[PDB]
Design a protein around this nucleic acid. Structure first.
Ligand SMILES: [K+]
Ligand SMILES: [K+]
Ligand SMILES: [K+]
Ligand SMILES: [K+]
Ligand SMILES: [K+]
Ligand SMILES: [K+]
Ligand SMILES: [K+]
Ligand SMILES: [K+]
Ligand SMILES: [K+]
Ligand SMILES: [K+]
Ligand SMILES: [Mg+2]
Ligand SMILES: [Mg+2]
Ligand SMILES: [Mg+2]
Ligand SMILES: [Mg+2]
Ligand SMILES: [Mg+2]
Ligand SMILES: [Mg+2]
Ligand SMILES: [Mg+2]
Ligand SMILES: [Mg+2]
Ligand SMILES: [Mg+2]
Ligand SMILES: [Mg+2]
Ligand SMILES: [Mg+2]
Ligand SMILES: [Mg+2]
Ligand SMILES: [Mg+2]
Ligand SMILES: [Mg+2]
Ligand SMILES: [Mg+2]
Ligand SMILES: [Mg+2]
Ligand SMILES: [Mg+2]
Ligand SMILES: [Mg+2]
Ligand SMILES: [Mg+2]
Ligand SMILES: [Mg+2]
Ligand SMILES: [Mg+2]
Ligand SMILES: [Mg+2]
Ligand SMILES: [Mg+2]
Ligand SMILES: [Mg+2]
Ligand SMILES: [Mg+2]
Ligand SMILES: [Mg+2]
Ligand SMILES: [Mg+2]
Ligand SMILES: [Mg+2]
Ligand SMILES: [Mg+2]
Ligand SMILES: [Mg+2]
Ligand SMILES: [Mg+2]
Ligand SMILES: [Mg+2]
Ligand SMILES: [Mg+2]
Ligand SMILES: [Mg+2]
Ligand SMILES: [Zn+2]
Lengths: 45, 57, 110, 119, 46, 235, 192
RNA sequence: UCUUACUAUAGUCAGGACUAUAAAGGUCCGAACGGGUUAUCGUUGCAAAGAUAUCCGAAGAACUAUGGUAAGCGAGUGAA
RNA sequence: GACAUGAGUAACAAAAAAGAGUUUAAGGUACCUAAAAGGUAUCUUAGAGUCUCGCCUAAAGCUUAUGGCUACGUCAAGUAACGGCCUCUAAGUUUAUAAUCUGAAGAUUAUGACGAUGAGAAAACUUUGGUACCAACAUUUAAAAGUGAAAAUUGUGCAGGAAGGAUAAACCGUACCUAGAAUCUGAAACAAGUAAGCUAGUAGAGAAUACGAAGGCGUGAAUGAGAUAACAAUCAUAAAGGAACUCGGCAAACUAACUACCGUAACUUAGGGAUAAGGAGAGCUCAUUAGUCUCGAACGAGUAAAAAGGAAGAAGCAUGGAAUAUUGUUGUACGACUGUUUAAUUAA
RNA sequence: CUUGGCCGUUAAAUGCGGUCUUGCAUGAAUGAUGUAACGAUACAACAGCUGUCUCUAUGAUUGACUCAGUGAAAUUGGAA
RNA sequence: UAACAGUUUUAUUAACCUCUGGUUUACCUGUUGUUUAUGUGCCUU
């Protein structure tokens, strides 16, 4: 970060979990390091 | 109401011109032979054909 | 021109009642419909009330003819005429005026 | 369309500057260019007419649009008048400003005699 | 007219004001029980 | 804005196959990371001993999982790791009589904390991608899309089976930048040794197959002191 | 007392009315058919035929006007200016068809109709004419002038036309769709 | 368990402004909160006292919570 | 008590809002087929879900209370991440004891007991009186900065601000509902009312105003679909005139907020009146830059840094652009003033 | 008695303000009297503003109306 | 003969929109705040 004073230009989205929901299968907000990996399928109970 | 409505006058209001009109605008479906309404689609062929176009395609 | 069911203001030119000085649900109403027992204990025939308006015959008299064109088939008359565009109207010589000259009545017949 | 309690600009050299209409002489409908009215002087300019006098006036121009025979329509930015007497002739001697051309056929030749501009 | 006088009513005040022990431990409360018992009431208190 | 993936076959960076959809295994999708080359990535800017052990707690009734770097969990873990899966389904607090340690991962090198912090990241990222972007369960397996929003919320709270599969994948090199790898770049690479302690021997069978660098042991340190005996299969 | 209504207000507000019509046209282009009330099918028709005319136009304004009527332009604009544009490139208007049916909701009993895209994959009048021609050939009956007239309507502007219509009649006879149909020569002897 | 007064234990009052104070004011503008000025609607009402708008107080003689005390010959409580 | 009439009428209208697909179970019809079956389609009843649209949003959301005619597989030694029970006491209570008073019933004082709305050791392992005190208000303080608490420090004002005790894990509560969509009080599935915490973000002085991420909702057919007459309600706009309306400017409209802007009268208890009145400015682009910040190497460059900034400039009918804050002045009576009152017709 | 006399305000004043007195039947802590400040008190005037009005018109939603579903009430000696 | 120029008012009733206005809730244009979708999008070797 270049400017650190509290009044610096705020160009980030302060709503981290924007449009993010588990019941509606919204998907991740950003591309994670495991986003291109096939979800491991476990053995059911 | 000042007085009770008699049986004569209440029957006039309920029956004079309030007879359920018969539906005579009826024809038969061409591909079905079933009785349908005039200028309307056959309800039996609609669902069947609507379902037949869902399997084939 | 037809106007469907009309109130008392449009049909008979009633003035209506107040707008804000306490009036309660009677801004466009017709008010009193008549007098009490001495007047007949009834609503008199011919009482002006709401109802259907328009869609009736109407005559406009003494309208000159400004233009006459046979090709287009039009007869331009001064003023307004009852009805909508495309409606049929009846045109005839004015009754409150003298008939056209004898020469004209004979020339047309000729 | 001049009616009761309407404020007018007297453009006559009679002493009044702003008059208030009190009556429409000779008709019920609102007065327009060329109609008589009874006004009450509310302001003066500095035997002139003093504030509070009741005189007859003639509407010379109005802010309401005026239809004419030839389809031409005239609208003025303000409503003005000229004071007259019960006889009908002007009280003042000169008129400053444009007046409506409807004063011609309404028998106001005296008012037009000293009218510099007609519109 | 009637008023919603039981709004926000707690059941701790019912036991204190109309409970069984508010009556067996007072002279006038023993009458209520004896009166209600003579009539055959099942609900002697609260 | 969010971007949900689809249940389609993709290549994996792990040694073993995580899912039946995985196309290939041990695929290098990006150049090795800086710490991957290093044989012994040390605890540069973290406390002494941090990262060498990673704990996993679960709800023994509803199946909700929480990862932790310390032997205990706090209210923060519950607020930051549990998404809203419906009403009356997100506990307002941690109840001591419901949450028990699920497992514990201990690395061979007791001073290379950087490897554990990476294994911890991939585990939390996989979990977020299980609660969200569960395209592999909409029409297959549990079929969450064929269920009601109530039953769907109760199946999304049950992350214990998925978590025990995320460990077999993360410990096998799943993910990009997973420091569980060790590239020589003389180019040969291998996996780092690790040990997983289980309170229940049967829980470790949720993963269809485990890697060859993980050692399985019964009993987590500190649980025997609480008079909690582990569950053994062979008895 | 005032002016006659320009269009149906459908007992709704201005914003709701506009949104409702955009949904009816968005589902029509997405599914090629919708089964709704007759008044809604007739109001969404005028907006659907004006949206298909926008696709034929080549101006950039036409493309922004279509983006402002559909509710998922990113997904349906390719289909509007793609398959649909090619379909109605030689048809001068009348891109939709409203057909009355029985009440979709028996509780209300409200008159209902199907709004379809002509020459589409789910054209109902195209399938009803094929079923009629199928019953005729199966019963050795002579097609009426009204059946032949409809046979030319649903095969004039279609891609292949008659070929796509004969395959429908053949497939309907392959599965015995006309099994149990009453012959027209026995209609006059039925009171029920 | 309503309501009036008192009592004990507690809680609440965004932000801004003026004034001698950083904090000393039955101060000012204005939300929450508390009131109920005016009008309309309603009047077999959504409501046996409501709705909408407008208006008043809003660090105080303030508002609120859980308990307690005082009432029916004599009158409890009462800014009446 | 039963059954009529009004009447198959009113009503099922909180100004949130619906549209098109899909699917499960049971059952009713039609056809296929007559070996029963099964299949295809449709309808009824009880549900579930997908795409789109909208409403609430310091809630109509989430977590919990008071409470509950909603339903019973709701799980704890303690702390982090919990209350009760238990200990201590306040206001008070007492058919406890003693003494005293008293037509009886009883009452009083003292002691005891009981009595929360308060106080109760330790823990991510644990078992004297300003040398003061923990009412209000202000200030300071967990060292990168900011913000919100906790506790403590210092100080201010008068209205002068509790009590008491100390310091190997029993029993009880744990389900659901929180009032705009099926649960509390209002006779009820009532447009009313009810406690605590949390309550995305942009933008702001702000919990104001507008949008709304998640969540919820767009009621148990307690409704649905049409049509868009009079009239009513709730609104919007309006030529010319501008209170001519009316008991009366009732209602409505005008005005409005912001700035460390300019200016501000009579009178006055000298505090005020006063935010009097009346004016000016505002958004976007840009010249310009002492310091702070960033970058490169004192200096140079930069607003993909906060700010400052001028009689600069551009576009449009309009830059307090949408929403939010409802006129100004003057003369009297009455009452000094802030307050209080007929819960639900009189607020003076 | 009375719309008391005069003055000012209005084109027009039983109102309002100032003033004079013979005040049916003002008057001094049932306080008398004069200002500042204060008031959702009451009265009057001015400017502005407006559908309050001259004089209404158009537009919007919900009802009203029709179809489908459910289904009241006051009232009624008997009624051609 | 041609050309040019001039030939009431008020009130009331009704009809009618050529004109002059008012209205315009699915028309065009401009524009503020905020949200959503899609496209695009910084410097340097
Ligand atoms: K009669
Ligand atoms: K205030
Ligand atoms: K009705
Ligand atoms: K708000
Ligand atoms: K306990
Ligand atoms: K005694
Ligand atoms: K509510
Ligand atoms: K007013
Ligand atoms: K009160
Ligand atoms: K016109
Ligand atoms: Mg017509
Ligand atoms: Mg009127
Ligand atoms: Mg009204
Ligand atoms: Mg008679
Ligand atoms: Mg009472
Ligand atoms: Mg209470
Ligand atoms: Mg719970
Ligand atoms: Mg309706
Ligand atoms: Mg709108
Ligand atoms: Mg104050
Ligand atoms: Mg009424
Ligand atoms: Mg005040
Ligand atoms: Mg009736
Ligand atoms: Mg009716
Ligand atoms: Mg069936
Ligand atoms: Mg005790
Ligand atoms: Mg307590
Ligand atoms: Mg209830
Ligand atoms: Mg309710
Ligand atoms: Mg709710
Ligand atoms: Mg709905
Ligand atoms: Mg106007
Ligand atoms: Mg105007
Ligand atoms: Mg008047
Ligand atoms: Mg009058
Ligand atoms: Mg310009
Ligand atoms: Mg007072
Ligand atoms: Mg007061
Ligand atoms: Mg009262
Ligand atoms: Mg009152
Ligand atoms: Mg005295
Ligand atoms: Mg009905
Ligand atoms: Mg025209
Ligand atoms: Mg449009
Ligand atoms: Zn058929």
């Amino acid at each position: 970060k270049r400017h650190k004073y509290p009044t610096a230009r705020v160009t980030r989205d302060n709503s981290k979990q924007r449009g993010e929901s588990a019941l509606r299968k919204s998907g991740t907000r950003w591309k994670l390091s495991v986003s291109d990996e096939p979800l491991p399928e476990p053995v059911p109970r | 109401p000042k007085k009770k409505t008699s049986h004569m006058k209440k029957r006039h209001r309920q029956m004079a011109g309030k007879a359920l009109k018969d539906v005579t605008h009826l024809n038969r479906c061409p591909a079905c032979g079933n009785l349908k309404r005039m200028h309307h689609l056959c309800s039996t062929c609609l669902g069947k054909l609507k379902g037949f176009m869902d399997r084939n395609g | 021109r037809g106007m469907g069911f009309a109130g008392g203001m449009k049909r008979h030119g009633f003035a209506g009642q107040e707008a804000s000085h306490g009036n309660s649900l009677n801004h466009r109403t017709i008010g009193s419909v008549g007098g009490s027992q001495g007047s007949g204990s009834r609503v008199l025939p011919g009482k002006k009330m709401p109802g259907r308006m328009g869609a009736q015959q109407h005559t406009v008299q003494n309208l000159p003819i400004l233009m006459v064109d046979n090709e287009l088939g039009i007869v331009v008359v001064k003023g307004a005429v009852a009805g909508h565009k495309g409606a049929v109207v009846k045109v005839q010589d004015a009754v409150k005026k003298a008939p056209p000259p004898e020469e004209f009545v004979e020339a047309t017949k000729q | 369309m001049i009616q009761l309690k309407t404020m007018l600009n007297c453009i006559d050299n009679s002493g009044a500057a702003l008059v208030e209409c009190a009556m429409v002489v000779g008709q019920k409908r609102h007065a327009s260019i060329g109609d008589r009215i009874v006004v009450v002087v509310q302001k003066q300019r500095g035997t002139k007419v003093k504030r509070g006098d009741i005189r007859h006036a003639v509407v010379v121009r109005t802010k309401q649009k005026v239809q004419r025979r030839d389809g031409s329509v005239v609208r003025f930015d303000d409503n003005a008048c000229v004071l007259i007497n019960k006889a009908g002739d002007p009280i003042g001697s000169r008129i400053n400003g444009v007046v409506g051309q409807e004063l011609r056929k309404k028998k106001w030749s005296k008012i037009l005699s000293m009218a510099p501009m007609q519109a | 007219g009637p008023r919603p006088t039981m709004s926000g009513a707690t059941r701790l005040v019912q036991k204190r004001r109309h409970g069984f022990l508010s009556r067996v431990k007072t002279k006038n409360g023993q009458k209520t029980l004896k009166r209600r018992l003579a009539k055959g009431r099942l609900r002697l208190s609260a | 804005s969010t971007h949900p993936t689809t249940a389609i076959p993709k290549p994996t960076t792990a040694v073993l196959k995580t899912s039946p959809l995985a196309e290939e295994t041990a695929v290098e999708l990006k150049s090795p990371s800086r710490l991957q080359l290093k044989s012994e990535p040390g605890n540069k800017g973290n406390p002494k001993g941090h990262g060498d052990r990673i704990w996993a707690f679960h709800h023994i009734e509803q199946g909700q999982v929480i990862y932790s770097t310390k032997p205990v969990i706090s209210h923060q873990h519950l607020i930051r790791q549990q998404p809203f899966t419906g009403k009356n389904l997100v506990p307002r607090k941690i109840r001591k009589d419901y949450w028990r340690p699920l497992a514990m991962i201990e690395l061979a090198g007791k001073d290379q904390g950087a490897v554990g912090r990476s294994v911890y990241q991939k585990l939390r990222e996989f979990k977020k991608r299980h609660e969200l972007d569960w395209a592999n369960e909409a029409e297959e397996g549990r079929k969450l899309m064929h269920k009601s929003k109530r039953e769907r919320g109760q199946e999304l709270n049950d992350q214990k089976p998925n978590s025990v599969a995320d460990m077999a994948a993360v410990l096998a090199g799943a993910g990009k930048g997973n420091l569980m790898w060790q590239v020589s770049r003389l180019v040969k690479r291998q996996l780092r040794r690790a040990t997983v302690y289980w309170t229940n021997e049967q829980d470790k069978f949720h993963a269809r197959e485990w890697s060859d660098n993980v050692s399985h042991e019964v009993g987590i340190p500190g649980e025997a002191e609480k008079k909690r005996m582990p569950i053994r299969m062979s008895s | 007392a005032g002016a006659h209504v320009k269009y149906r207000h459908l007992s709704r507000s201005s914003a709701h009315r506009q949104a409702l019509l955009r949904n009816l046209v968005t589902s029509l282009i997405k599914n090629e058919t919708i089964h709704t009330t007759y008044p809604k099918a007739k109001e969404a028709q005028r907006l659907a035929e004006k949206l298909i005319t926008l696709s034929k136009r080549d101006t950039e304004t036409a493309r922004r006007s279509a983006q402002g009527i559909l509710y998922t332009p990113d997904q349906l604009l390719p289909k509007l200016f793609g398959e649909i544009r090619e379909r109605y490139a030689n048809r001068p208007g009348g891109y939709t068809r409203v057909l009355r049916t029985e009440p979709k909701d028996q509780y209300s009993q409200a008159p209902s109709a199907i709004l379809e895209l002509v020459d589409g994959p789910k054209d109902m009048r195209f399938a009803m004419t094929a079923a009629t021609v199928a019953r005729d050939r199966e019963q050795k009956t002579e097609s009426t002038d009204l059946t032949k007239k409809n046979m030319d309507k649903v095969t004039r502007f279609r891609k292949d036309g008659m070929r796509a219509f004969e395959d429908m009649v053949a497939s309907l006879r392959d599965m015995k769709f006309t099994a149990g149909a009453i012959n027209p020569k026995e209609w006059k002897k039925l009171d029920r």
